[PDB]
Amino acid sequence: EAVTLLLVGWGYAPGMQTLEALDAVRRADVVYVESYTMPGSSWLYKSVVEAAGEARVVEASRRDLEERSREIVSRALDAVVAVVTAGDPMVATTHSSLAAEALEAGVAVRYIPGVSGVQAARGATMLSFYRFGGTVTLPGPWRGVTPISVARRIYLNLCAGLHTTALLDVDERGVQLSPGQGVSLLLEADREYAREAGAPALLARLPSVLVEAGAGGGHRVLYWSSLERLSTADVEGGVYSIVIPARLSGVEEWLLAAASGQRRPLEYDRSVYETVEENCKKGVYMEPV
């Protein structure tokens, strides 16, 4: 069994593992498990060990996969090595680099998909799958960076009529940045960006959906009339993703209202989208930054 790498998505909660993923990890010779690319992933290690046998599972750190990725590509003996990620390994992680060096280093690579929390979150909002656009990550204050390029990508989605998926950063402890803090720094970035772009700051005025994908279909979908409101809200703790929609289609307002347990008309600033539209047409949002 020549060196073979298995990039396995484990799903984001117990019970969300596919049969082939369970099988793959059981049939591997070694099992590295990384729980740093996903917040609230403490359950991961235990769940894997449970599947493999407590005799092959191995905690893998970021620098191990990023700095010492040359080892995991273990081209020393010849074996089946598995790298397990909560969610899906190709969604919002840089594990494709591991697969690429492996492929180039002769190793056979198998990508076993898993349900990612991002996909489940987008799905829970019930917004049109076809309208989702680019995804950004809102940095925590420990990165020491005001996300100006991030604000711009959101406007780029808006100009294309696409919904933005905004992920929240995670620190050392594996603690997710709170929606309020993530959005606050985003809005500070927006004010800085609009300033240099020569246009009013508009993101604070956009409605948004705060979602936490869950197990057994228990997702939580909360409609926020404006990001301004969310930026100062101390919401319940949770592993969330934020969806900042482009102007909703009539059918979408109905779908989103049902998903968030809200009544139509959904309330939100009724002039912000037309103003974004105007700046889009003026070419304001292309420089770049």
UniProtKB/Swiss-Prot annotation:
Q: Where does S-adenosyl-L-methionine bind?
A: D88, V91, S116, G117, L168, A215
Question: What Pfam families does this protein map onto?
Answer: TP_methylase (PF00590)
Keyword vocabulary terms for this entry:
Methyltransferase, S-adenosyl-L-methionine, Transferase
Report a single Gene Ontology molecular function: diphthine synthase activity
Q: In which pathway does it act?
A: Protein modification; peptidyl-diphthamide biosynthesis
> Which biological process annotations from GO are given for this protein?
methylation; protein histidyl modification to diphthamide
Function, as annotated, reads: S-adenosyl-L-methionine-dependent methyltransferase that catalyzes the trimethylation of the amino group of the modified target histidine residue in translation elongation factor 2 (EF-2), to form an intermediate called diphthine. The three successive methylation reactions represent the second step of diphthamide biosynthesis.
Instruction: Give the record's family classification.
Output: Belongs to the diphthine synthase family.
Subunit details for this protein? Answer: Homodimer.
The name on file for this protein is Diphthine synthase
What is the gene called?
dphB
